[PDB]
Structures are given as C-alpha cells and as structure tokens.
Scaffold this motif. Structure first.
Motif, PDB file in Angstrom:
ATOM      1  N   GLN A 223       0.820  -1.206   0.000  1.00  0.00           N
ATOM      2  CA  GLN A 223       0.000   0.000   0.000  1.00  0.00           C
ATOM      3  C   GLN A 223       0.856   1.259   0.000  1.00  0.00           C
ATOM      4  O   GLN A 223       0.463   2.269  -0.594  1.00  0.00           O
ATOM      5  N   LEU A 224       2.016   1.224   0.658  1.00  0.00           N
ATOM      6  CA  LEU A 224       2.953   2.336   0.547  1.00  0.00           C
ATOM      7  C   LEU A 224       3.439   2.491  -0.887  1.00  0.00           C
ATOM      8  O   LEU A 224       3.576   3.612  -1.387  1.00  0.00           O
ATOM      9  N   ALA A 225       3.703   1.373  -1.565  1.00  0.00           N
ATOM     10  CA  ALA A 225       4.094   1.427  -2.967  1.00  0.00           C
ATOM     11  C   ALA A 225       2.988   1.977  -3.855  1.00  0.00           C
ATOM     12  O   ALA A 225       3.286   2.633  -4.857  1.00  0.00           O
ATOM     13  N   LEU A 226       1.724   1.725  -3.515  1.00  0.00           N
ATOM     14  CA  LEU A 226       0.616   2.275  -4.288  1.00  0.00           C
ATOM     15  C   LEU A 226       0.415   3.769  -4.069  1.00  0.00           C
ATOM     16  O   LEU A 226      -0.104   4.441  -4.967  1.00  0.00           O
ATOM     17  N   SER A 227       0.807   4.303  -2.912  1.00  0.00           N
ATOM     18  CA  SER A 227       0.602   5.713  -2.597  1.00  0.00           C
ATOM     19  C   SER A 227       1.873   6.531  -2.787  1.00  0.00           C
ATOM     20  O   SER A 227       1.949   7.670  -2.318  1.00  0.00           O
ATOM     21  N   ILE A 228       2.879   5.970  -3.460  1.00  0.00           N
ATOM     22  CA  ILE A 228       4.124   6.675  -3.735  1.00  0.00           C
ATOM     23  C   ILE A 228       4.508   6.615  -5.206  1.00  0.00           C
ATOM     24  O   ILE A 228       5.538   7.171  -5.590  1.00  0.00           O
ATOM     25  N   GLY A 229       3.697   5.983  -6.049  1.00  0.00           N
ATOM     26  CA  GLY A 229       3.985   5.900  -7.466  1.00  0.00           C
ATOM     27  C   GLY A 229       4.671   4.623  -7.904  1.00  0.00           C
ATOM     28  O   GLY A 229       4.184   3.940  -8.810  1.00  0.00           O
ATOM     29  N   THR A 230       5.791   4.283  -7.278  1.00  0.00           N
ATOM     30  CA  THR A 230       6.580   3.138  -7.725  1.00  0.00           C
ATOM     31  C   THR A 230       5.865   1.832  -7.402  1.00  0.00           C
ATOM     32  O   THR A 230       5.615   1.548  -6.224  1.00  0.00           O
ATOM     33  N   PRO A 231       5.526   1.016  -8.394  1.00  0.00           N
ATOM     34  CA  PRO A 231       4.877  -0.268  -8.133  1.00  0.00           C
ATOM     35  C   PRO A 231       5.883  -1.414  -8.078  1.00  0.00           C
ATOM     36  O   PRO A 231       7.079  -1.245  -8.325  1.00  0.00           O
ATOM     37  N   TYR A 232       5.366  -2.593  -7.743  1.00  0.00           N
ATOM     38  CA  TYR A 232       6.151  -3.819  -7.764  1.00  0.00           C
ATOM     39  C   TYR A 232       5.973  -4.523  -9.103  1.00  0.00           C
ATOM     40  O   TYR A 232       4.858  -4.626  -9.620  1.00  0.00           O
ATOM     41  N   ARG A 233       7.078  -5.011  -9.660  1.00  0.00           N
ATOM     42  CA  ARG A 233       7.081  -5.633 -10.975  1.00  0.00           C
ATOM     43  C   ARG A 233       7.639  -7.048 -10.898  1.00  0.00           C
ATOM     44  O   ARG A 233       8.432  -7.381 -10.013  1.00  0.00           O
ATOM     45  N   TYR A 234       7.214  -7.875 -11.847  1.00  0.00           N
ATOM     46  CA  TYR A 234       7.620  -9.272 -11.933  1.00  0.00           C
ATOM     47  C   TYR A 234       8.592  -9.433 -13.094  1.00  0.00           C
ATOM     48  O   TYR A 234       8.299  -9.007 -14.216  1.00  0.00           O
ATOM     49  N   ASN A 235       9.740 -10.045 -12.823  1.00  0.00           N
ATOM     50  CA  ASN A 235      10.757 -10.239 -13.849  1.00  0.00           C
ATOM     51  C   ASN A 235      10.630 -11.618 -14.490  1.00  0.00           C
ATOM     52  O   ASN A 235      11.588 -12.391 -14.520  1.00  0.00           O
TER      53      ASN A 235
ATOM     54  N   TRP B 229      10.307 -11.194  -8.269  1.00  0.00           N
ATOM     55  CA  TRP B 229       9.764  -9.846  -8.182  1.00  0.00           C
ATOM     56  C   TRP B 229      10.897  -8.832  -8.110  1.00  0.00           C
ATOM     57  O   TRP B 229      11.816  -8.970  -7.296  1.00  0.00           O
ATOM     58  N   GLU B 230      10.829  -7.813  -8.961  1.00  0.00           N
ATOM     59  CA  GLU B 230      11.882  -6.818  -9.059  1.00  0.00           C
ATOM     60  C   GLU B 230      11.677  -5.779  -7.953  1.00  0.00           C
ATOM     61  O   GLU B 230      10.772  -5.898  -7.124  1.00  0.00           O
ATOM     62  N   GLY B 231      12.516  -4.747  -7.925  1.00  0.00           N
ATOM     63  CA  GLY B 231      12.473  -3.788  -6.840  1.00  0.00           C
ATOM     64  C   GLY B 231      11.253  -2.889  -6.898  1.00  0.00           C
ATOM     65  O   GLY B 231      10.601  -2.725  -7.930  1.00  0.00           O
ATOM     66  N   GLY B 232      10.947  -2.300  -5.746  1.00  0.00           N
ATOM     67  CA  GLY B 232       9.858  -1.363  -5.619  1.00  0.00           C
ATOM     68  C   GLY B 232      10.346  -0.019  -5.121  1.00  0.00           C
ATOM     69  O   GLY B 232      11.116   0.675  -5.792  1.00  0.00           O
ATOM     70  N   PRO B 233       9.898   0.378  -3.931  1.00  0.00           N
ATOM     71  CA  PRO B 233      10.385   1.627  -3.340  1.00  0.00           C
ATOM     72  C   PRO B 233      11.885   1.575  -3.097  1.00  0.00           C
ATOM     73  O   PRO B 233      12.468   0.518  -2.847  1.00  0.00           O
ATOM     74  N   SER B 234      12.514   2.744  -3.180  1.00  0.00           N
ATOM     75  CA  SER B 234      13.954   2.837  -3.004  1.00  0.00           C
ATOM     76  C   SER B 234      14.332   2.514  -1.561  1.00  0.00           C
ATOM     77  O   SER B 234      13.492   2.474  -0.659  1.00  0.00           O
TER      78      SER B 234
END
Ligand code: K
Ligand code: K
Lengths: 660, 660
Positions: A363-375, A377-382
């Motif tokens: 939910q933090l990733a949804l409210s900060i722009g950067t999503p989670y991606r599947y390669n 799972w690749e990186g999300g928030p910095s």
C-alpha cells in the motif's frame, strides 16, 4: 590524602614491638608504644610515654657500658644501627633485647621519628641472674621468655652450637628493611602497584566518553545493518567496524587494571580483588565484543555495558532531560527496524510467488507511485525511502499522534502494534513523570520567594497597614532577596562540623578582624571564638538602629556606609566605614539607655556582637581582654549624654535679658 | 532615596582634610573629621570630635589675632571665606594652614554644617620657631611638612620669588567650588547626567510594551510574507513596515541612554559603562533592524530582543499561562509556513513540467473541488484557503490529535514530520510541566486548610469526643480561618528586622494605645517595647477566659465585645469596649486565684499582656511606671472576693427565726 604511617609499620611487622620516639626533642621522648611492647616489658601505655626513646627506663644493675654509650652515639648522628643490650623489666626480670634503631624522614629529609623495634632474645644468650635460689630458674626462663622464637622465628635448622645463625642473620637486615619497614612520614596520595589505572584520574574520563559515543554509534548502526540488508563499502564501513571492535577489546583488556570503590570504604587497589570482581560480574560485556543476526543482537549488550557506568555521565537535572531524548530517539529507531522486518517478511508470499495485497509495503508502494514488478519480483520503493517511511510510522505510534496513512492491517502487524502500544505508553509515562519532577525541582527555588511575597502582601492588605510601612517592608523583602537569593547562612552553617564552621565564620567577618586595631594582638583560638557570635545586619536609608530609649546591648562595627547620631534633633556624630559605636560592656556591667537616635544615611553594613557573647568570650581568654580594652576606642558612646545649647536658646535668653 | 553627602565631598576632594562641624550648636562642635586630617594634625578621631570647628584646639603661643577674630566673625554670619592661619600640632610643630570655611545648606536653606577643608602650607610661608637649636631645622621642616605640594599641587612653574601664584591662585576658588565641593545635605534621589533615561521611570514601560506588541506583529507577519508570497498594498502595508522599522531604529538609538542594574549593586548611570555594555552584548539586535528570505530571517531576532527583557512583563502565575498560549500560537504558525513552503516546492516538478501526485497540495486540491489546470500550470486552491489548510495540519500535529486527512506522504514531508514530532513533544512536555507547577502553587493555599480540617475531624472522631466540644472546635477552626486565611502573624513578623517589626506591632495594637488614658504620657521608645508583648485572642460566645481557680497572670484590654464576670452564679460585672480586667502586678508580686468566671457574651477581641513581660518593661523605664500605676484603674479586679448575700438566704433566715 592520608598520612598512613601506623598502618605501613604494622602490616610489614608481624607482631613487633616498635617504639616510635621523637627525634628533635632532647632525650628523645617516646611518642607511641605498640601493644606488642606492652607485654615484652610489663609496662602499660601510661609511663613509657614521655620517657626517653633510648630505653633508659629499663636499666638496672646488669646493663653494660659496651653499647649504652654507643646507643647515645648512634642517636646523636642520625643513622640506623642494630645494637643489642641487656634490659630489666617491670617484674625485675633481666632479659636481652635486640635493638634496631632506625630514623624516619619527613617530606623533606629531616629525621622526625626514630623507629625502635625490639625483639626478645633469651634462649640465644647466656642467662645471668643474681636474686635466684637455684640455677635451673634461669634455664627455665630461657624458654619462658622466648616462646615465639621456638616455632617460626629462628628454628629453620634447630640444633646446638649454632649462634652464628642468630647474630649475622639480621645484623644488616635494617638496610634490607629500608623498603619493608621504613616508610615516609608524609601526606601520602593513594598509592597503587605498577601498571594500575585509577578510575578517578583524568585519563579514564576520556575513555568513558569515547565508549559512550561508540556505544551510541553501535546502537544506531547495528539494527539498521541487520534489518536493512546492505553491502560493504570496505574503505569506509569495514574499517570503522574493525576499529571499533579493536577499541572495545582494548577496553575489555584495560578493565582488568581499574580500581573499584569498596562496598564499605574507598578505592581498593588490590589486583586479586579487582580480577575476582570482574570474573564474578562482567564477562557479559566480554562475550559480545569477541566473535549474522544473533552475533549483532548479542553485540547490542554493549549498550548495557555503557549503561553500567550511568553515574559519572549523569546528574539529576538537564542530563536526565538529554538522556530522555537520546533514548526516545533510539527506541523509535529499534522499533522502526523491527517494523520494516515484519513488513518485509510478508510482502512476497514465496509459497505461491504472489504479492500480499493487505501488507503495509504494498500500500505504501501504491501511494508513492513506484509499483512492484515481476521479472522473481523486481524492486519497488527505493532503499532511502523505506527507512524514512518506517521511522515515520514508529514516531507516529510513539507520540500518540496516529495519522493512520500507514497502518497495521494484515494479521501480524496488528499483533506487533498491540505490543508497541504498551512499551510506548510505559515510556511516555516515565518521560512525563521525570520531566514533571525535574521541572518541579528546578522551579522550586523561585516558588518560595513568590509565596513569601504573596504572604507579606496579604498580611499588609488585611490589617490595613499604612502606605509608608507597607512600601518599606515590600522594598526590604526585595532588597534581602536581591543579594541572598535562597541562600540562608543558618542552615548551610548548620550541616558543617565545628572545625570548618569557625573558619567560614572567620572568613565572613574578614573586614572587622583585618582593618581594625583592636583585633591585632589576638590569638587564632580567640578569633575563631569571636567570629561565631558576630552577626550581620543590612540597614536601609531612614532605618534606626538604636532609638532614644532602647537598651544598648550590642557592639556594632560599620564596614560599609554612613550613619547619623542625632540627639535633641541635632547631628552630633557622622559615623562611616570603620567606626565602632555602642557601650563599654566590660567595665560597666550595667545596661544603659541609648541617648541618641542612630539613623542610616546610605545602604549600610554593620557587624554586631551581642553583650552576653562578648562578655562570655572576654571572661575566658583573660589575656586578649586587656588588649581589647586598651586598643578599642568608641567613636560614639551611646551612654553619655552630650549637653549643649543651641544658638536659638542663647538669642532668646539675650532677648529676655534685654526686656528686663 | 539616599542621603549621600560623604561621597560627594571625597570624590571631588582628592585627599583633603575636611572637618565638617555643626553650625546650630554654639561653639560649633566638630561632627566628622576626615582621615586626611588625622595625619595633618597628629590627632586621632577621639579628641577632635565635640571640640570647636573653628580649630581652637590647635592654638598656642604663636597664633595672631589678625584672623582669629575674623574667623569668629565669618562663623557668626553664615558666609564662605578663605582665611589663613598659623596653627600648632600634637607634636608642638607650628605650621601654617589655609582655612576654607564654607557653609552647607539643607533641603530648605538653613546652614546646617560647616565644611572646613584644610591645606598644609609651610614651604610657601616664612618659618617661625622658638624652641630650636639651629636655624636649619625650620628650613628642613619647610620641605618636611609640604611634601605633597612639591609634585603636583603648586609646581606648575617652579621658581623663586613667586608667592603670588600661591595667594590669589585659590583665594576666590571657594565660589568656583560651589558646584565642585558644596553639595546639599538632602535626601537625594538617583541623579543622572543630562539626557539620560532611567529604566525604572514611567516612560520606558510604555516603550517596552510597544516593543512587545510590535515584536509579536513582526513574528506573525514576517514568515507569512516570506512564505506566502504576496504583493504590496502600499497605502496599508508598506507604511506600517516603514513605521515599525523607524520605531525600532529609534529604540536602538535610545538604548544608548539607559541605566543597567549593577552586577553587585544598583543603577549605574555612567555613560561609558552603558556604552561598553551595549558594545559587548547586544549589537545582534542592531544588525536586524538596519538593512528577501535572509533579511527577514535575520529580522526575526527582534523576538529574541524582546525576550531579553522577559523580567518586567512576566511574573510566576497567570502571566506564564498567557505566555504559554501566545508562544504555542506562534510555533503553530511558523511550522504552518514551513509546511506550506515544503508542500509548494514539490508540487510542480519543473524538470519535466508535471504535477507530482503524491504531494499534499494536489490531494488537498482533489478533496476541495478546485483542480490544477495547464495553460505553465494555472492556479489551484485560493490563497485564503492555503493558509487555513496549512495551519490545520500543524495544529493537528502539535496537539497530538492527528485526523490524518492531510498527511505527509511524498519523501520529504515524512522527513519534516519526524522533526516536527520532536519539537512538538518537547513543547507539550514543557507546557504540561509548567501548568502543573502553576496549579500546584495556586491551590497550595487551600490545601493546608482542608488538611487541617480533615486532621481535626479525624481526631474528634477517633477519640469519641462528645458532640458539644466537637462542634465547638469545628466552629472555632472555621471562625479562625474566616478572618486569617493563611496569613500567620508569627512568620510574617519573623522575616522583618527589629526596627519595622516594632512599628507594625504598634500599628496592630492601635486601639489600646489611643483610646485609653494609661498610654497617654508614654515615650515612643516605651510604646515600641510594650507593643511587642501584646498578644491577641478571639473569644467566642460561651468561652471562659479565667476559671474559678486559674492564676491571673495577664492584663487584658477589651477592644470589641462584652464579657460577664460571674461569681457564685451571680453576675457582678459586665465589661465591654474599653474595660481592663486582671490583677495588679506591679504592687503585689504574688500570683492570685481568679475568684470569678469571666465568660464571653459576644464575639470578643482582647489584647493580652503577660505578667512577666509587663513587669520586665516596667522594671526598665521607671518613669512611665508611675504614670501607669496612677492612671490605670481596673474595672474588675480578679483577686478580691466580693462577699454578698442573696435574698433567698435572707428569706430562709427570716423563716428560721420565725420558726423559733
Ligand atoms: K495525549
Ligand atoms: K491521537
């Protein structure tokens, strides 16, 4: 700074009979007879004292002049020597003693005392006795006198015709005892064995503060490393960790050479006791430094190590205020690491390789722009935002703000927050107890003053006191609190002993004992007796010290200001800065009537000694009394009435005689 | 209000020998001899006093009548003059002195004292000596006597035959010294040089309050202007800013003419010291007023300037309560400006010209209707709502409410809120410490009273005291607390000196010393001695002052109320409002038995003087004692028994005699 001299002698003596005697005085009077000599001579500690240290009271009809003159010689010029003599006793029993006279020096070599340890010698000498009926009495007395020497003194190889193990065995031992028993009659400082570090010196303070700084650094940087998994920069992180570990290992090594304060005394500089204490108490701190999650978690006990010494860094005041913030900022970081670990465990459900939608990182990733991606799972928030966002939530949950944009919502974050809300409440309660107590202590000084002002104002308003006296009292209270703010001499001098209280009182009245001829030929033992009775008053303009009818019963010394002696509304004397006024107490023995009003002209300082105390002190040291009588002349005696005639009366009389 | 007279003389004298003497008294007795005269005449301060100020004790066989009669003349009519005379000495050494007699006036010109500064003159006069063996002795004495005059006094142009620089040099200087050394023997007020402003007068208070108001205005309006960028209205904003700047520059200028309180004394009106202090201390406040973000940020130190004087505006009480709100409302505004600046920096990412969707201004725009539009990006929320919405968040974050509809969510607002939550917690803790201490101080007055009531009630309930005494004591406690609420005379009179305590005691007993014939011919020095011993009791109806067997040992004066003297259950006297009752103490020397019960009929006020204190005071001033004995008649002497016969006994006797 102790002058331990009687302890060094006994502990290296093993039941001796040392007979310290004064050296500067003629005939060398004895000054201290050990209890051991109270049984080797039959004399108690009531007649050995004040007699000659040459042992001239144990002579008789058998002493030979072979060494007595030599004893006086070796006493004349200060030099240790080991004569042997035959001496009598209280019960008239002649026995031989082995003298071991040796001088003892002061801070600068002056030969102050003469150590004169004795030693019974009767078995090792030919018996001689005159008033004896049978010859076996002296042979029995040989063993009777020397009972201690038959076990451990001179029985290493017991046989006959072996007197040579008795003469030269301790003939020259006096120089060998120069370090054993010949201490210095000095004001000694705490002595320590070589290579021992005192905990009071100005060296261990720097190490204590360095250890404090490094413990804060480790407490900050260990949970971050074990929670936010980061790689090694080598040239800037590994070096610091290695240096800190080496420093703390050196601290553990040096902890073997400290001096702990005794349970019922002072510093104990005994290496065996220090080692025993460290073995018994604090290898918990040794385990952590020497050689992952568990290793760093047990390294965290180094904070407890530095909290052990929480007595030198801390006082009860602003130090507690700083500590209560430095520990809050550390709790908010430890919980920020635990929370990130909890919220990173449950994001990616590795059982089925799917993202859990009810965590807090997603939910933090949804409210900060950067999503989670599947390669995977690749990186999300910095990584620079996952710590700010994780300390934000902890800081909201500890200060009881709770913005609720990052909230526990899965199954376990609600289990962790229930535990967080108890430790946070406890910490908050302790902080708000300590801050209230600290503020109450800090502001309790200026509460008594305001309470006094309020009480005085209410008293002056309830009884309708006129404006004059009301303003005068209101000004007097402020004036007294403006130079004696909270400090009261009575209570402060009450908790001091009889010795230093006299010194403080003498110091306070230093402007009456120095700049005044009367207190010139005065013994110190009398100045310390007068200074206790000298009070002090702080006059104000317009104040009257003596009215026109009061009884003069106090000698007053003016030390600052000016006074005015008005009689019949006429100025007759202007005292100031070193003028005494009062009544002659020692030569009159009658209280008088103050025949003139003494009124202040400027803010004055008077030092007052009452009649009774002055008479009591002057009735005891009847040697300073004569000098006091012959050297103190009053500038304005408030007993004799000055009779005069104003010019107005003379003019009126002239007019009357002109009329008729 | 000091009477500084001895300080003005010396500081403008430069080691003189002034000889102040009384003028009203005949023969003008000396009143104060300076230490300088203690060496120019060989006389100590024990025989110059009480002698004539005309210097008649330094005469001999060489004084000439050319000026002595003139000296008496100039002393007769008050007028300064500069005679010169030849005088002897204690060691019989005739030398010439230069008299400088000059009168000194009171508050209203009365010529009270006569300044008589001397000056040695021996080099500048022809030597004359009779008891001398050689003529060189007087020539040597010329230099011996005048040693100070060979360096700086009269050696500006040293040569021979130059006596004219010695006669007329200071012949008329006495009038030129009218402002130098001729002060006024007055109760002086603090004197200041021209154009100097005292910090205590009623003028600097208005400036202090004006500066406080303007500092609050600047603190409110500067961050708003430097954060919410607004244009200039000119006629209503620029004028106010210019006026405020001019006012504070004028304040800086006027700060050079203030009077600071001395570190160990009172006001120091020395311009050099004031300037040095201002140079050393407070040009930080000068920098801010004189000549953007940085300029206004440094202007904000004007609040620190007004906080420097936080001693005259503030007391420990409601003032702190008002200050703790006025500073909370300012912190909540400074943070509201910083927060808007932070939230306006990151809205429009000017690098790519896009709106950041995770700010706080954009989400506020989404929840208020007005969106952001692209033209550059056009306006969004109004300027009158961006401040309310920015003070809302700060006020929620400082009061620990946290509604969480405006929350930090980007990357930096979470960094700013972590810092906000520390200063907010510290401010909250200080506020809740101060409010608790203030409330404790305020309500500590009415806690002692309730504790006393609870203790008395528990005592009366534990021991099963009957209802009568229980209710009587419970009423007495309330009655005493209803007129003496917290104020206790003993402690209040304990902190006052011996002088004003007597005046307060005399004032308290003003209704026994005024409206009573006995205290009519009484000296003030005796009234101040009796008034210390006069106690006071507050009787209640039914209370008994003296029982039927107690010892009368106190003289009581009724000042309000009524009493009843019952003997054998018969009323024999009704005292009230100015009737004394007791025992004659001075003429009996024996304690008696109270032969009648004195019971109060109304709430009474009695003033009681004990037997011992009255006898002690009457045994010292044996002049008021006779008037006291002959003028005080007791209305009810509680020593003599009044024998009577009730009518019932007479009727019974008549019946008995009728029977037989
Ligand atoms: K709260
Ligand atoms: K809350």
């Amino acid at each position: 700074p102790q002058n331990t001299f009687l302890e060094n002698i006994v502990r290296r003596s093993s039941e001796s009979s040392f007979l310290l005697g004064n050296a500067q005085i003629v005939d060398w009077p004895v000054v201290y007879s050990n209890d051991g000599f109270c049984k080797l001579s039959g004399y108690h500690r009531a007649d050995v004292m004040q007699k000659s240290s040459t042992c001239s009271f144990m002579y008789g009809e058998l002493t030979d002049k072979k060494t007595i003159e030599k004893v006086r010689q070796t006493f004349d010029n200060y030099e240790s020597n080991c004569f042997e003599v035959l001496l009598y006793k209280k019960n008239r029993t002649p026995v031989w003693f082995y003298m071991q006279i040796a001088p003892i020096r002061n801070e600068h070599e002056k030969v102050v005392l003469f150590l004169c340890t004795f030693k019974d010698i009767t078995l090792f000498k030919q018996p001689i006795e005159d008033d004896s009926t049978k010859g076996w009495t002296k042979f029995a007395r040989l063993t009777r006198a020397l009972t201690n020497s038959r076990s451990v003194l001179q029985q290493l190889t017991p046989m006959n015709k072996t007197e040579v193990v008795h003469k030269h065995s301790r003939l020259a031992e006096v120089l060998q005892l120069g370090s054993d028993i010949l201490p210095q009659y000095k004001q000694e400082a705490p002595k320590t064995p070589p290579h021992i570090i005192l905990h009071y010196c100005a060296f261990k303070t720097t190490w204590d503060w360095v250890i404090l700084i490094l413990t804060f650094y480790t407490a900050i940087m260990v949970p971050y490393n074990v929670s936010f998994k980061t790689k090694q920069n080598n040239i800037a992180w590994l070096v610091l960790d290695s240096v800190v570990d080496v420093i703390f290992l050196v601290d553990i090594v040096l902890n073997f050479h400290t001096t702990f304060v005794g349970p019922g005394g002072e510093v104990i500089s005994d290496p065996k006791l220090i080692r025993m204490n460290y073995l018994k108490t604090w290898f918990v701190i040794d385990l952590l430094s020497c050689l992952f999650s568990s290793l760093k978690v047990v390294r965290l006990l180094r904070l407890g190590r530095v909290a052990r010494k929480l007595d030198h860094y801390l006082e009860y005041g602003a130090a507690v205020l700083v500590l209560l913030v430095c520990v809050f900022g550390l709790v908010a970081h430890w919980l920020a690491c635990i929370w990130y670990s909890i919220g990173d465990y449950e994001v990616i459900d590795e059982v089925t390789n799917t993202i859990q939608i009810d965590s807090w990182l997603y939910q933090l990733a949804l409210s900060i722009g950067t999503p989670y991606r599947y390669n995977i799972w690749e990186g999300g928030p910095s990584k620079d935002s996952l710590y700010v966002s994780s300390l934000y939530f902890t800081m909201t949950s500890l200060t009881t703000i709770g913005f609720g944009n990052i909230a526990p919502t899965t199954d376990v974050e609600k289990m962790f927050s229930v535990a967080m809300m108890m430790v946070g409440s406890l910490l908050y309660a302790t902080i708000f107890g300590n801050v209230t107590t600290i503020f109450q202590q800090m502001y309790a000084n200026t509460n008594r003053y305001h309470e006094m002002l309020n009480n005085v104002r209410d008293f002056l308003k309830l009884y309708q006191v006129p404006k004059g006296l009301s303003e005068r009292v209101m000004d007097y209270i402020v004036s007294t609190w403006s130079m004696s703010k909270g400090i009261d001499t009575e209570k402060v001098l009450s908790i001091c002993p009889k010795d230093m209280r006299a010194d403080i009182c003498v110091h306070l009245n230093r402007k009456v004992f120095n700049e005044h001829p009367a207190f010139r030929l005065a013994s110190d033992g009398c100045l310390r007796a007068l200074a206790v009775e000298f009070q002090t008053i702080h006059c104000a303009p317009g104040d009257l010290i003596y009215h026109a009818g009061e009884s003069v019963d106090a000698l007053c010394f003016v030390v600052s200001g000016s006074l005015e002696v008005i009689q019949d509304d006429e100025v007759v004397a202007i005292l100031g800065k070193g003028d005494v006024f009062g009544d002659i107490f020692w030569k009159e023995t009658t209280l008088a009537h103050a025949c003139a009003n003494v009124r202040a002209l400027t803010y004055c300082d008077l030092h007052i000694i009452k009649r009774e105390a002055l008479l009591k002190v002057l009735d005891f040291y009847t040697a300073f009394a004569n000098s006091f009588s012959r050297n103190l002349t009053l500038t304005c005696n408030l007993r004799k009435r000055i009779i005069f005639r104003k010019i107005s009366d003379v003019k009126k009389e002239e007019e009357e005689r002109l009329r008729q």
